[PDB]
Structures are given as structure tokens and as C-alpha cells.
Design a binder for this molecule. Structure first.
Ligand SMILES: O=C(CO)N[C@H]1[C@H]([C@H](O)[C@H](O)CO)O[C@](O)(C(=O)O)C[C@@H]1O
Length: 308
């Protein structure tokens, strides 16, 4: 095609992310009259999300996914998006990004500094904790060998609840669980399904600890080359895809209990009061490290009423 473009992702071919990206690619092909074709590169073929964000910056990859929280790699205060238990729900995640001074200035920085244009935001689920033994309370987290992604906020979740974290890439997790090299991991229900972690984890605990969004990102090097009518095709398609993406996750969160129980998984509901209390020193550390900018981001986000 005139524009043979590429969309990379960590998520695999059975995932909601991939299904929504498929929708995006199909609409862009159709509505561009075939001028743009977007091919998909799932399962970390191109590297992880850190690597793929660098590829958007350089222009060697056209589209990718990231969370708002991922930008804590560049702007430490943006860890606010993934401080456990701070963001109540997706409604808060949306307003935090688009309707705070903090969020709006982040979007502008992603463009100016990082060479990426934010097309749309979707919901990517609320992370829960799977394991090879029951988590009936916070006591069961003590010394649990808990895999985490290579992200500071997930590492801190594991540390402050009393677990023993092992960072590793998403692609490596299934084998780590299967072999019991680690005891557990944490991800939204949809990812537990998509990666088939239920095959290698007997237990799931509703820790409700971090809320993931999902940003549809384009490389400025690519977006600048598209005539403006095709830019609009791409933006409109990303917006349509994000709405579908969010629905896939919302529907799955009300539907997946039946699925996991049918697969033999035991689901627990530990008291979250001590999980939340265990985070108080982390929040203090975040404020110490990120200073006024972090205190401000937290104030702005904690001001958002969670009720639609
Ligand atoms: O790659 C992205 C893009 O948002 N998100 C990945 C996500 C992400 O890299 C982390 O939440 C850090 O922001 O990590 C996982 O949840 C995981 O490795 O458990 C996989 C998920 O696909």
C-alpha cells in the first residue's frame, strides 16, 4: 500500500487489545480507500512496550499501546496513574488524563519530547493477583514470589504488601508460573484469560490494586506524513476502536468469574483494608521523591469524583 504501517504490542492474538487493534486496522484500511494498511506485530515480537515507545520516537514503528502510568519513565510524577489504590476507576483515569492540568501537560510533553501523538484512551482492566496457593489475606502475600512487569509501581505494589518481587517481561511469565520459578503474577482478568495463566495458576485473588488504561499512540514521524484527511481517518478510527476496547474489558469483568471457575480456578476475596494501609508509606515516598509536581498531580487526581 501507499502507507504500509505497523502496530506493535505486548498483547497476544487472543487478547482484547489485539481484537481492538484489528478493528482499528480494518477501519483505517476501508476509510483510507486502501491507501493505508496497518499490520499487527503482537506478543512482543518487536520488543517490550519500552522498546516499542522508542521505536515510535525514532519513527521505525508507526503505532503502539502504552499506559498513562508508563510515562513515569520520563516524568516521575506520572507514577500517580499506577500508585496502588489511588485511581478509583476508569472514570477517574479518563478525567485524570484529559481534564487535569497535569494530564493535559503530559499529553503535550508526549508530543514535544517523546515524538508521539495520543489518538485515544481505552480501559485495559483492573489488575488482580493469581498464585499457586490461596491468598485469603495480606498474610499470604508475605514472601510470595510475585512476578511483576519491569515497572516501578508494580515493583512497589509487591514490596509494600510484603511479597518478594521478580521482575520479568510479559512474554516470560507463563513459563515462570508453569515451572513454579515464581508463585504468582498480577494482571487484569482479561490478561489472565488471554495468556492462559489460568492453566498454571490454581488461585485468583481480588486485590483490585492498579487500574490500567490503554493509549493508542502514533509516531509523529508517521503522522506528519499523512495528508490531513488521512490523519483524521486514523484519529477517528482510534477513537472508535478505544470505545470497543473499553467495552470488551467492562464486559469481561462481569463475565469472567464463570469462566475461571469452570477452568478450576479458586477465587478469593481478601480484606483489602490492610493492602491499602500497606501503601501509605509508598505514597509518602512518592511525595518525597517527586516533590511538588507529585504532590500536585496527586491533589488533582484525588479531587476527581469517581461517580459519573
Ligand atoms: O504493553 C503494554 C502497553 O500498555 N502493557 C503491558 C503492561 C505494562 O507494560 C505494565 O503494566 C507497565 O506499564 O504489562 C503487562 O500487564 C505485564 O507485563 O504484566 C502486559 C501489558 O500488555
Amino acid at each position: 500500500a501507499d502507507y504500509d504501517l505497523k502496530f506493535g504490542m505486548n498483547a497476544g492474538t487472543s487478547s482484547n487489545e489485539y481484537k481492538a487493534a484489528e478493528m482499528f486496522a480494518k477501519e483505517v484500511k476501508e476509510k483510507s480507500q486502501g491507501k493505508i494498511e496497518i499490520s499487527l506485530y503482537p506478543s512482543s515480537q518487536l520488543g517490550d512496550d519500552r522498546a516499542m515507545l522508542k521505536q515510535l520516537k525514532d519513527g521505525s514503528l508507526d503505532f503502539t499501546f502504552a499506559e498513562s502510568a508508563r510515562f513515569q519513565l520520563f516524568y516521575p510524577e506520572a507514577a500517580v496513574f499506577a500508585l496502588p489504590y489511588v485511581i478509583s476507576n476508569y472514570n477517574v483515569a479518563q478525567k485524570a488524563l484529559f481534564d487535569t492540568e497535569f494530564g493535559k501537560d503530559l499529553i503535550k510533553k508526549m508530543d514535544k519530547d517523546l515524538g508521539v501523538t495520543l489518538l485515544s484512551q481505552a480501559y485495559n482492566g483492573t489488575r488482580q493477583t493469581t498464585s499457586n496457593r490461596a491468598i485469603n489475606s495480606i498474610a499470604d502475600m508475605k514472601g510470595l514470589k510475585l512476578r511483576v512487569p519491569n515497572a516501578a509501581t508494580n515493583l512497589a505494589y509487591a514490596k509494600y504488601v510484603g511479597a518478594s518481587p521478580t521482575p520479568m517481561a510479559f512474554s516470560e511469565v507463563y513459563l515462570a508460573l508453569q515451572t513454579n520459578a515464581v508463585d504468582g503474577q498480577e494482571n487484569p482478568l482479561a490478561a489472565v484469560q488471554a495468556q492462559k495463566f489460568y492453566e498454571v495458576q490454581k488461585f485468583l485473588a481480588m486485590t483490585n490494586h492498579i487500574l490500567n488504561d490503554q493509549l493508542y499512540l502514533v509516531s509523529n514521524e508517521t503522522y506528519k506524513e499523512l495528508p490531513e484527511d488521512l490523519q483524521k481517518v486514523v484519529k477517528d478510527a482510534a477513537e472508535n476502536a478505544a470505545k470497543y476496547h473499553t467495552k470488551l474489558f467492562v464486559d469481561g469483568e462481569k463475565d469472567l468469574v464463570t469462566f475461571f471457575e469452570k477452568q478450576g480456578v479458586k477465587i478469593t476475596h481478601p480484606d483489602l483494608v490492610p493492602f491499602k494501609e500497606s501503601m501509605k508509606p509508598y505514597y509518602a515516598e512518592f511525595v518525597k521523591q517527586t516533590g511538588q509536581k507529585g504532590e500536585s498531580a496527586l491533589k488533582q487526581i484525588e479531587a476527581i469524583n469517581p461517580h459519573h
